[PDB]
Amino acid sequence: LTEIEHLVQSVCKSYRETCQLRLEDLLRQRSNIFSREEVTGYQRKSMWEMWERCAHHLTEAIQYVVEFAKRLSGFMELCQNDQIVLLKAGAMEVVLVRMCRAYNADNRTVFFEGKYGGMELFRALGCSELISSIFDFSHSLSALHFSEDEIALYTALVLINAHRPGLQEKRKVEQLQYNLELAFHHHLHKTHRQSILAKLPPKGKLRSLCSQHVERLQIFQHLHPIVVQAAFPPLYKELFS
Numbered sequence: 001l002t003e004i005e006h007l008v009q010s011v012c013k014s015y016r017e018t019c020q021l022r023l024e025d026l027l028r029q030r031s032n033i034f035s036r037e038e039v040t041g042y043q044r045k046s047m048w049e050m051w052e053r054c055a056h057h058l059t060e061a062i063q064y065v066v067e068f069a070k071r072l073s074g075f076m077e078l079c080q081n082d083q084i085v086l087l088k089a090g091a092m093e094v095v096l097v098r099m100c101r102a103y104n105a106d107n108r109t110v111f112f113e114g115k116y117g118g119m120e121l122f123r124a125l126g127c128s129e130l131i132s133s134i135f136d137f138s139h140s141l142s143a144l145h146f147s148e149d150e151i152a153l154y155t156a157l158v159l160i161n162a163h164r165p166g167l168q169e170k171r172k173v174e175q176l177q178y179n180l181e182l183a184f185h186h187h188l189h190k191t192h193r194q195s196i197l198a199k200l201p202p203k204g205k206l207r208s209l210c211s212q213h214v215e216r217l218q219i220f221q222h223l224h225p226i227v228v229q230a231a232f233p234p235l236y237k238e239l240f241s
């Protein structure tokens with residue numbers, strides 16, 4: 001078996017071990033939808049409470065993406081600067097992509113605290129525009145019906161991007177990126193799924209949505225700080241300073 005077929009297997013394994021929620025569970029729970037009364041309960045919570053809940057869920061989701069990154073071939077052999085540069089730019093882009101698995105395009109609901117709810121669940125945050133953009137992005141991804149293996153390979157490429165500003169060893173990230181691009185393209189060809197390539201988000205789209213998202217989280221963090229046990233302190237200290 002080729003280096004490339006082994007790379008496909010390694011990335012798909014890493015994803016399976018760090019996917020946080022099982023696709024099977026997410027699909028089964030689609031019928032489990034918040035009642036009008038439960039939605040009203042969430043809308044009546046203080047911004048501060050909804051922020052504490054959402055901030056903690058987002059931090060947990062980031063930590064699954066850090067673990068995913070640490071299991072990708074070559075990631076740990078990059079200099080720490082480059083690990084931080086990739087995860088700082090990339091980890092929340094991966095969370096936003098991972099969301100499409102927990103999103104039902106039929107009723108525009110997301111899996112949140114054990115049931116599916118629409119974007120009005122989050123009314124107390126005062127972020128309707130930004131949250132609507134996040135729901136829209138998941139909506140556009142859901143049309144692809146990504147396989148588990150496609151999302152493993154795609155989210156590896158979201159992270160391993162030699163064009164991120166600030167890399168010391170751009171050559172080394174280029175080498176890992178070329179191999180992951182070949183693995184993704186190789187797997188799509190083998191599974192007759194090259195049709196998704198033209199349907200993938202235009203680039204800049206994920207970067208600019210993620211930029212806006214993180215900007216808002218940094219404002220909330222500045223006004224009402226949460227603390228977590230840092231999975232990757234050098235990275236954590238670059239956002240939670």
Ligand SMILES: O=C(O)c1ccc(-c2nn(C(=O)c3c(Cl)cccc3C(F)(F)F)c3ccccc23)cc1
Pocket residue numbers: 055056058059062063066087088089090091092214216217218219221226228229230231232233235236239240
């Ligand atoms: O456990 C850790 O080591 C760790 C855990 C999380 C991050 C990380 N948080 N983050 C946020 O945007 C964030 C979140 Cl999710 C919750 C509350 C406040 C914030 C904010 F202050 F940064 F804005 C990120 C964005 C992009 C990339 C990595 C991260 C980094 C490291």
Ligand SMILES: CC(C)=CCC[C@@H](C)[C@H]1CC[C@H]2[C@@H]3CC=C4C[C@@H](O)CC[C@]4(C)[C@H]3CC[C@]12C
Pocket residue numbers: 019020021054057058061095096098099100102110111112122125127130131134213216217220
């Ligand atoms: C802008 C702002 C202040 C808040 C954003 C509100 C809202 C859009 C956030 C809060 C919790 C997030 C989920 C948390 C965990 C997961 C699991 C992951 O495996 C996939 C992603 C997912 C489902 C997150 C999706 C985005 C959520 C709902």
